[PDB]
Amino acid sequence: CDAFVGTWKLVSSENFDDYMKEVGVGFATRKVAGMAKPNMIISVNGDVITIKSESTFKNTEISFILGQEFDEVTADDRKVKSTITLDGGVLVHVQKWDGKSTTIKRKREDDKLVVECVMKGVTSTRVYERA
């Protein structure tokens, strides 16, 4: 995951409000979370990958080993079971909760780190660049 390591700043977002609606996020959280321009800090130590999100809304952090399920409390306060794997260079992150599922894909494209969030038929694309 060397090409993911570093500090990344959100530069564009598309359809994030609609994605959050599909996930079930309520109005007030959607408004405040949607304003945020987070930094994403990715680091690797051995087999442990750490992804931190720093924002005015809610600072989060996950550490994980690829293929090994873990507990995650998301920024919108869902308690989910998560598994992250590498599929052909793309970090694929599946979250399970309350019988539902959403998938977050993270990949390097040119000088960007592109995050694609999918809930049923609704996708949001969030693009980051190096700080």
C-alpha positions as YAML, in Angstrom:
chain: A
units: angstrom
residues:
- id: 1
  name: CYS
  ca: [0.00, 0.00, 0.00]
- id: 2
  name: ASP
  ca: [3.00, 2.32, -0.30]
- id: 3
  name: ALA
  ca: [1.29, 4.52, -2.91]
- id: 4
  name: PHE
  ca: [-1.53, 5.22, -0.43]
- id: 5
  name: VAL
  ca: [0.68, 6.34, 2.46]
- id: 6
  name: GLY
  ca: [0.67, 10.01, 3.31]
- id: 7
  name: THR
  ca: [-1.60, 12.93, 4.04]
- id: 8
  name: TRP
  ca: [-4.45, 13.57, 1.62]
- id: 9
  name: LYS
  ca: [-6.86, 16.51, 1.46]
- id: 10
  name: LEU
  ca: [-10.38, 16.36, 0.05]
- id: 11
  name: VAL
  ca: [-10.60, 18.41, -3.15]
- id: 12
  name: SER
  ca: [-13.97, 17.39, -4.61]
- id: 13
  name: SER
  ca: [-17.12, 15.52, -3.68]
- id: 14
  name: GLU
  ca: [-20.03, 14.32, -5.82]
- id: 15
  name: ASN
  ca: [-23.36, 12.85, -4.68]
- id: 16
  name: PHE
  ca: [-22.24, 12.48, -1.05]
- id: 17
  name: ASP
  ca: [-25.52, 13.78, 0.37]
- id: 18
  name: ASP
  ca: [-27.45, 11.22, -1.68]
- id: 19
  name: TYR
  ca: [-25.06, 8.43, -0.63]
- id: 20
  name: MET
  ca: [-25.57, 9.37, 3.02]
- id: 21
  name: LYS
  ca: [-29.35, 9.37, 2.54]
- id: 22
  name: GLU
  ca: [-29.16, 5.84, 1.13]
- id: 23
  name: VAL
  ca: [-27.03, 4.76, 4.10]
- id: 24
  name: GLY
  ca: [-29.69, 6.20, 6.45]
- id: 25
  name: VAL
  ca: [-27.87, 9.24, 7.86]
- id: 26
  name: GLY
  ca: [-30.25, 11.82, 9.32]
- id: 27
  name: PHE
  ca: [-30.68, 15.40, 8.14]
- id: 28
  name: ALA
  ca: [-28.56, 17.27, 10.68]
- id: 29
  name: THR
  ca: [-25.63, 14.85, 10.48]
- id: 30
  name: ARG
  ca: [-25.82, 14.93, 6.67]
- id: 31
  name: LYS
  ca: [-25.61, 18.74, 6.64]
- id: 32
  name: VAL
  ca: [-22.65, 18.99, 9.02]
- id: 33
  name: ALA
  ca: [-20.79, 15.94, 7.71]
- id: 34
  name: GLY
  ca: [-21.28, 17.12, 4.12]
- id: 35
  name: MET
  ca: [-19.61, 20.47, 4.83]
- id: 36
  name: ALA
  ca: [-16.41, 18.82, 6.04]
- id: 37
  name: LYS
  ca: [-13.20, 18.98, 4.03]
- id: 38
  name: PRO
  ca: [-11.30, 16.17, 5.77]
- id: 39
  name: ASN
  ca: [-7.69, 15.19, 5.65]
- id: 40
  name: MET
  ca: [-7.03, 11.46, 5.31]
- id: 41
  name: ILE
  ca: [-3.78, 10.20, 6.84]
- id: 42
  name: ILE
  ca: [-2.75, 6.69, 5.76]
- id: 43
  name: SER
  ca: [0.20, 4.84, 7.26]
- id: 44
  name: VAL
  ca: [1.48, 1.27, 7.34]
- id: 45
  name: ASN
  ca: [3.45, -0.52, 10.04]
- id: 46
  name: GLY
  ca: [4.19, -4.14, 9.23]
- id: 47
  name: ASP
  ca: [0.89, -5.68, 8.22]
- id: 48
  name: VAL
  ca: [-1.21, -3.07, 10.06]
- id: 49
  name: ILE
  ca: [-2.71, -0.29, 7.95]
- id: 50
  name: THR
  ca: [-4.03, 2.83, 9.71]
- id: 51
  name: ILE
  ca: [-6.46, 5.27, 8.10]
- id: 52
  name: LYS
  ca: [-7.24, 8.46, 10.02]
- id: 53
  name: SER
  ca: [-9.79, 11.06, 8.98]
- id: 54
  name: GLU
  ca: [-9.29, 14.49, 10.54]
- id: 55
  name: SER
  ca: [-12.12, 16.95, 10.07]
- id: 56
  name: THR
  ca: [-14.14, 19.68, 11.68]
- id: 57
  name: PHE
  ca: [-17.03, 17.18, 11.85]
- id: 58
  name: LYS
  ca: [-15.61, 14.04, 13.47]
- id: 59
  name: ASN
  ca: [-12.06, 12.69, 13.77]
- id: 60
  name: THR
  ca: [-11.96, 8.93, 13.09]
- id: 61
  name: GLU
  ca: [-9.26, 6.26, 13.00]
- id: 62
  name: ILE
  ca: [-9.18, 2.61, 11.93]
- id: 63
  name: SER
  ca: [-6.29, 0.17, 12.09]
- id: 64
  name: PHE
  ca: [-6.64, -3.17, 10.38]
- id: 65
  name: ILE
  ca: [-4.99, -6.15, 8.72]
- id: 66
  name: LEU
  ca: [-6.13, -6.96, 5.19]
- id: 67
  name: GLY
  ca: [-8.74, -9.71, 5.11]
- id: 68
  name: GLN
  ca: [-9.40, -9.60, 8.88]
- id: 69
  name: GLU
  ca: [-12.77, -8.33, 10.09]
- id: 70
  name: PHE
  ca: [-12.86, -5.56, 12.70]
- id: 71
  name: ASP
  ca: [-15.27, -3.27, 14.55]
- id: 72
  name: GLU
  ca: [-15.68, 0.28, 13.30]
- id: 73
  name: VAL
  ca: [-17.76, 3.18, 14.61]
- id: 74
  name: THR
  ca: [-18.27, 5.36, 11.54]
- id: 75
  name: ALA
  ca: [-18.29, 9.18, 11.46]
- id: 76
  name: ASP
  ca: [-22.12, 9.12, 11.40]
- id: 77
  name: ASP
  ca: [-22.09, 6.84, 14.48]
- id: 78
  name: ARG
  ca: [-22.96, 3.51, 12.87]
- id: 79
  name: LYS
  ca: [-21.50, 0.48, 14.66]
- id: 80
  name: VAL
  ca: [-20.37, -1.68, 11.75]
- id: 81
  name: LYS
  ca: [-18.39, -4.84, 11.05]
- id: 82
  name: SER
  ca: [-15.74, -4.06, 8.45]
- id: 83
  name: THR
  ca: [-13.41, -6.06, 6.24]
- id: 84
  name: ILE
  ca: [-10.79, -4.41, 3.99]
- id: 85
  name: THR
  ca: [-8.90, -6.27, 1.26]
- id: 86
  name: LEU
  ca: [-6.69, -5.30, -1.68]
- id: 87
  name: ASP
  ca: [-8.29, -6.25, -5.01]
- id: 88
  name: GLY
  ca: [-5.97, -5.55, -7.92]
- id: 89
  name: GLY
  ca: [-4.45, -2.50, -6.27]
- id: 90
  name: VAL
  ca: [-7.76, -1.12, -4.93]
- id: 91
  name: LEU
  ca: [-8.52, -1.09, -1.21]
- id: 92
  name: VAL
  ca: [-12.05, -2.56, -0.92]
- id: 93
  name: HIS
  ca: [-13.80, -1.84, 2.38]
- id: 94
  name: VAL
  ca: [-17.13, -3.55, 3.13]
- id: 95
  name: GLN
  ca: [-19.23, -2.37, 6.10]
- id: 96
  name: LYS
  ca: [-22.04, -4.54, 7.51]
- id: 97
  name: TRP
  ca: [-24.65, -3.34, 9.99]
- id: 98
  name: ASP
  ca: [-28.33, -4.02, 10.71]
- id: 99
  name: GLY
  ca: [-28.53, -6.40, 7.75]
- id: 100
  name: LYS
  ca: [-27.27, -3.66, 5.40]
- id: 101
  name: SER
  ca: [-24.03, -3.33, 3.46]
- id: 102
  name: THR
  ca: [-21.99, -0.55, 1.86]
- id: 103
  name: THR
  ca: [-18.67, -0.71, 0.02]
- id: 104
  name: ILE
  ca: [-15.96, 1.96, -0.02]
- id: 105
  name: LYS
  ca: [-13.24, 1.65, -2.64]
- id: 106
  name: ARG
  ca: [-9.99, 3.63, -2.40]
- id: 107
  name: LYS
  ca: [-7.51, 3.79, -5.26]
- id: 108
  name: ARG
  ca: [-4.64, 5.81, -6.67]
- id: 109
  name: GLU
  ca: [-5.39, 7.51, -9.99]
- id: 110
  name: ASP
  ca: [-2.77, 9.95, -11.33]
- id: 111
  name: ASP
  ca: [-1.89, 12.24, -8.36]
- id: 112
  name: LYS
  ca: [-5.23, 11.61, -6.70]
- id: 113
  name: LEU
  ca: [-6.63, 9.18, -4.22]
- id: 114
  name: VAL
  ca: [-10.18, 8.48, -5.39]
- id: 115
  name: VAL
  ca: [-12.75, 7.21, -2.88]
- id: 116
  name: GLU
  ca: [-15.92, 5.62, -4.29]
- id: 117
  name: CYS
  ca: [-18.72, 4.92, -1.81]
- id: 118
  name: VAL
  ca: [-21.54, 2.64, -2.99]
- id: 119
  name: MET
  ca: [-24.86, 1.94, -1.24]
- id: 120
  name: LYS
  ca: [-27.20, -0.08, -3.45]
- id: 121
  name: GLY
  ca: [-27.61, 1.98, -6.59]
- id: 122
  name: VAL
  ca: [-26.11, 5.21, -5.22]
- id: 123
  name: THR
  ca: [-22.44, 6.12, -5.63]
- id: 124
  name: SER
  ca: [-20.50, 9.06, -4.22]
- id: 125
  name: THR
  ca: [-17.03, 9.93, -5.53]
- id: 126
  name: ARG
  ca: [-14.67, 11.87, -3.29]
- id: 127
  name: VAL
  ca: [-11.29, 12.92, -4.65]
- id: 128
  name: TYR
  ca: [-8.23, 13.68, -2.51]
- id: 129
  name: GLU
  ca: [-4.83, 15.13, -3.40]
- id: 130
  name: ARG
  ca: [-1.59, 15.18, -1.41]
- id: 131
  name: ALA
  ca: [-1.39, 17.84, 1.29]
...
